[PDB]
Design a protein around this ligand. Structure first.
Ligand SMILES: *[C@@H]1O[C@H](CO)[C@@H](O[C@@H]2O[C@H](CO)[C@@H](O[C@@H]3O[C@H](CO[C@H]4O[C@H](CO)[C@@H](O)[C@H](O[C@H]5O[C@H](CO)[C@@H](O)[C@H](O)[C@@H]5O[C@H]5O[C@H](CO)[C@@H](O)[C@H](O)[C@@H]5O)[C@@H]4O)[C@@H](O)[C@H](O[C@H]4O[C@H](CO)[C@@H](O)[C@H](O)[C@@H]4O[C@H]4O[C@H](CO)[C@@H](O)[C@H](O)[C@@H]4O)[C@@H]3O)[C@H](O)[C@H]2NC(C)=O)[C@H](O)[C@H]1NC(C)=O
Ligand SMILES: Cc1nnn(Cc2cc(C(F)(F)F)ccc2CCC(=O)N2CCC(Cc3ccc(S(N)(=O)=O)cc3)CC2)n1
Ligand SMILES: [Ca+2]
Ligand SMILES: [Ca+2]
Ligand SMILES: [Cl-]
Ligand SMILES: [K+]
Ligand code: NA
Ligand SMILES: [Zn+2]
Length: 805
């Protein structure tokens, strides 16, 4: 019920929302069907349009008009945005030369520069260059302020997940808005774009920026706007709030445009009909900037122009149908389109089996345009699994395609030419970032970054402490002139032991053998020095990683590599080695094919054993430092130590051996040397975070050797590739991966072919940030470099995406 007989007199676009049954006057009342009877008349005036004309200048105030051109309008805060241009001889903001804003130039009574977020739906990154001739206001913000060539959205690349990620700094799996449509099985409730369930606060987790501000005594505008409020009135409303008295006036605001998304769905991303919507958005930016200039705020406010996601070419004829794969198609519910999510149609059907659905969808047609996954097997960089609202079965859809259940779903619902939602590394899904104002840098270009990082910066801009989030605070300090956040490196929790030779060979009963019984004072002192760390500066280039949790581990030194060996997990947490451009690749000699050697620094009780691998018919083993890259025949014996061994499915050994034998050397040739850090990851509950011992679901048969869910590598070199990796004076360059440790290669449809046709393609799909590996391992990397900590934070968030320009 609503008692719509109240009135909006003196309450238009009120900031405090009122409780039913009392009628509402706020910027969402229309969406709730709750506005007072007189809201249109009083709050949505349109008379005489949105621009002053020569004949209106100095008019007698008429309160019926949409905006004003009378002499009293500046003190009332309600002039048309072009008033000073038409009536007082001023220039439009876009026509003024740009001039560095070195300090905030704010009216008396402003305690801090306000922040205005101008958000645009569907604004693809390439529009900034391709549309620049028709967007002069936007082009000025871009060239004069701080800009990235693009900003990476979160997966799925849909509207609600991305706007709420911008507002919270959280991945969708943590904030709870995991699509535009959702079913929550604990609530037994469905969330949709249309309708009222989405207004229930239980869907929306974390803490959005407007709440963070309000809790810390910084007042906020209401961010949301009902679709029927025209853009001109949204801008006039912001400008009027900015004229409130000091104690009532907000410091943070948002504008939202449904364009260019709305037209992009109809016409495709570059349809000739797209020029007009871009023109219209630019005009809206111009109205805001002219309006700020009238209020003497144009060199006081920080403005962010940001998009949620891009737009791709997608038509009805590029649809794959599950009815062409499944016998049982009526026993499933599909969330369809640019991703798929599958669950049982009925919880009472005991003949539902996910294994058989997955198998019927795997590599069945030669050009198949989607790939099925159990959600825990999705690339870790997507962070798309730890939420009961994400269905176990997921379909990753190729760019330009849709998936649907049956053909009748597509013609009883071609209309559309654009859509979005695909993998967030796809070029067409990238969106925009520009920052302009006293707190941003002047004429500065910054590298691409992820939208999860912006909440921290918006908090910095307003002097707020951010709520706990998935950004890396300090990684975007290079965007800011002032208000930088200066973090300290985390303290190491566990210090290592440095074991010497403590065990005789006969103390070990591991069931291992090696043909190594082959015998010098020159070379003996030498090998002793290598075991005490004499080559460590070559192989550990950025210091040892720090262990940020409580555990027992040993540092082990060798000629060609250094490791941190866990006594609890019975394997290295990390293994570090450097491969120069000149390094040579060799084979594993015939006599050493099955060689595994006891490590006399590490007790039998804290070692793996060969017998377990023999008896486990599914599990084999591999090595973290590759025997192929040994510096000499004698050093090669170190690579077969039981302390360098890790458990590997034979199917995974195909991937790992090609990485180690072919790819590492290729990268050293291309990059002028590389430093490699490799290791295991355990994430059995798919939360993106290091497992404790009691979370491990699988062991090598009959032993306490835990099986990793994934294997990582971090590959570092000099950004100036004219210097070798091991003698680099300046910034670094990195690429990393987190490969799933699977007992089959079903993910790779071309795996019966030679590794040269499919392994590198797998690795590119599973590209990762250093920071992703940090979360998964409890390790902290790059502790000892010549670089500033903020620069290192930026390096740790880099993602190598393998898309062209
Ligand atoms: C990205 O950044 C975020 C934010 O920093 C990281 O997420 C945090 O990670 C922590 C660990 O997973 C987690 O800490 C736990 O908090 C529990 C209290 O949680 C409530 O309170 C907070 C604070 O206000 C709130 O934010 C939470 O909100 C979640 O849940 C509601 C719905 O209930 C949602 O609206 C919201 O979207 C959010 O959901 C997400 O997180 C939850 C987990 O909290 C997931 O289940 C969802 O799928 C979704 O992803 C909550 O309202 C606290 O109770 C925990 O303590 C347990 O564990 C410790 C171990 O130290 C143990 O000592 C305790 O005994 C206790 O265990 C008991 O409960 C167990 C389970 O019932 C039981 O088995 C035991 O036997 C015990 O009885 C814990 O400290 C923190 O909540 C989240 N925060 C958010 C916002 O998500 C995230 O990790 C980052 N991602 C990456 C990859 O780095
Ligand atoms: C989602 C989402 N998440 N966070 N925001 C706010 C936002 C954020 C950000 C920021 F700075 F982060 F970039 C910028 C702009 C907005 C406003 C978005 C807006 O104006 N739209 C119209 C209403 C629509 C339906 C709706 C109406 C009402 C409600 S609710 N449940 O809050 O009443 C939800 C969705 C949602 C889109 N939107
Ligand atoms: Ca959108
Ligand atoms: Ca985990
Ligand atoms: Cl969705
Ligand atoms: K075996
Ligand atoms: Na295969
Ligand atoms: Zn859209």
């Amino acid at each position: 019920w609503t008692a719509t007989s109240g009135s909006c007199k003196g309450r238009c676009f009120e900031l405090q929302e009122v409780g039913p049954p009392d009628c509402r006057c706020d910027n969402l009342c229309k969406s709730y069907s709750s506005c007072c009877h007189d809201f249109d008349e009083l709050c949505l005036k349109t008379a005489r349009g949105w621009e002053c004309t020569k004949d209106r200048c100095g008019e007698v105030r008429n309160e019926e008009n949409a905006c004003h051109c009378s002499e009293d309008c500046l003190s009332r805060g309600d002039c048309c945005t072009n008033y000073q241009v038409v009536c007082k001889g001023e220039s439009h903001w876009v026509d003024d030369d740009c001039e560095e804003i070195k300090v905030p130039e704010c009216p008396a009574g402003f305690v801090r520069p306000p922040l205005i977020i101008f958000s645009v739906d569907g604004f693809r990154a390439s529009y900034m260059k391709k549309g620049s001739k028709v967007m002069p206001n936007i082009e000025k913000l871009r060239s004069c302020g701080t800009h990235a060539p693009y900003m990476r959205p979160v997966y799925p690349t849909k509207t609600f997940p991305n706007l709420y990620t911008l507002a919270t700094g959280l991945y969708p799996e943590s904030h709870g808005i995991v699509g535009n449509s959702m079913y929550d099985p604990v609530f037994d409730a469905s969330f949709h774009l249309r309708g009222r369930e989405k207004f229930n606060h239980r869907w929306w987790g974390g803490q959005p920026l407007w709440i963070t501000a309000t809790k810390q005594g910084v007042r906020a505008g209401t961010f949301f706007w009902s679709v029927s409020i025209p853009h001109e009135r949204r801008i006039l409303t912001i400008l009027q709030w900015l004229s409130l008295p000091d104690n009532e006036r907000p410091s943070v605001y948002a504008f939202y445009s449904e364009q260019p998304d709305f037209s992009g769905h109809k016409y495709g991303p570059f349809g000739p009909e797209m020029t007009n919507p871009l023109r219209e958005i630019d005009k809206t930016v111009g109205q805001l900037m002219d309006g700020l200039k009238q209020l003497r705020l144009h060199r006081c406010v920080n403005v962010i122009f940001v998009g949620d996601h891009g737009m791709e070419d997608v038509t009805c004829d590029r649809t794959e149908f599950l009815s062409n794969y499944l016998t049982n198609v009526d026993d499933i519910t599909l969330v369809p389109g640019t991703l798929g999510r599958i669950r049982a149609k009925s919880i009472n059907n005991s003949k539902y089996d996910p294994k058989t659905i997955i198998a019927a969808l795997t590599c069945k047609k030669p050009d198949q345009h989607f790939k099925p996954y159990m959600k825990q097997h999705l690339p870790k960089r997507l962070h798309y699994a730890n939420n009961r609202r994400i269905e176990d079965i997921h379909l990753l859809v190729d760019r330009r395609w849709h998936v649907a259940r049956k053909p009748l779903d597509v013609y009883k619902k071609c209309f559309f030419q654009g859509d979005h939602g695909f993998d967030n590394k796809v070029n067409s899904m990238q969106t925009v970032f520009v920052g302009y104002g006293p707190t941003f840098k002047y004429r500065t270009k910054v590298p691409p970054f992820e939208n999860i990082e912006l909440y921290n910066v918006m908090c910095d801009l307003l002097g707020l402490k951010p709520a706990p989030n998935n950004g890396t605070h300090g990684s975007l300090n290079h965007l800011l002139r002032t208000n930088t956040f200066r973090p300290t490196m985390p303290d190491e929790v566990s210090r290592p032991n440095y074991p010497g030779i403590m065990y005789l060979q006969s103390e070990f009963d591991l069931g291992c053998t090696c043909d190594d019984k082959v015998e010098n004072k020159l070379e003996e002192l030498n090998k002793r020095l290598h075991t005490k760390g004499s080559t460590k500066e070559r192989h550990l280039l950025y210091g040892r990683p720090a262990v940020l949790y409580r555990t027992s581990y040993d540092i082990l030194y060798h000629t060609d590599f250094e490791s941190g060996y866990s006594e609890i997990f019975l394997m290295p947490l990390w293994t570090s080695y450097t491969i120069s451009k000149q390094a040579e690749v060799s084979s594993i000699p015939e006599h050493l094919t099955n060689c595994v050697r006891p490590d006399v620094r590490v007790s039998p009780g804290f070692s793996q054993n060969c017998l377990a691998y023999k008896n486990d018919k599914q599990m084999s083993y591999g090595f973290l430092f590759p025997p192929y890259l040994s510096s000499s025949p004698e050093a090669k014996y170190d690579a077969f130590l039981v302390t360098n061994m890790v458990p590997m499915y034979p199917a995974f050994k195909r991937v790992w051996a090609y990485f180690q034998r072919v790819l590492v050397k290729k990268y050293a040739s291309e990059r002028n040397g590389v430093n490699v850090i490799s290791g295991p990851i355990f994430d059995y509950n798919y939360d993106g975070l290091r497992d404790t011992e009691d979370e491990i679901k699988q062991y090598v048969e009959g032993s306490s050797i835990p099986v990793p869910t994934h294997y990582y590598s971090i590959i570092t070199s000099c950004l100036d590739f004219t210097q070798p990796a091991d003698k680099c004076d300046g910034p670094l360059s990195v690429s990393s991966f987190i490969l799933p440790h699977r007992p089959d290669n079903d993910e790779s449809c071309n795996s019966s072919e030679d590794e040269s046709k499919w392994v590198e393609e797998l690795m590119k799909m599973h590209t990762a940030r250093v920071r992703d590996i940090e979360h998964l391992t409890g390790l902290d990397f790059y502790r000892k470099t010549s670089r500033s900590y903020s620069e290192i934070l930026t390096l740790k968030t880099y993602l190598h995406t393998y898309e062209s320009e």
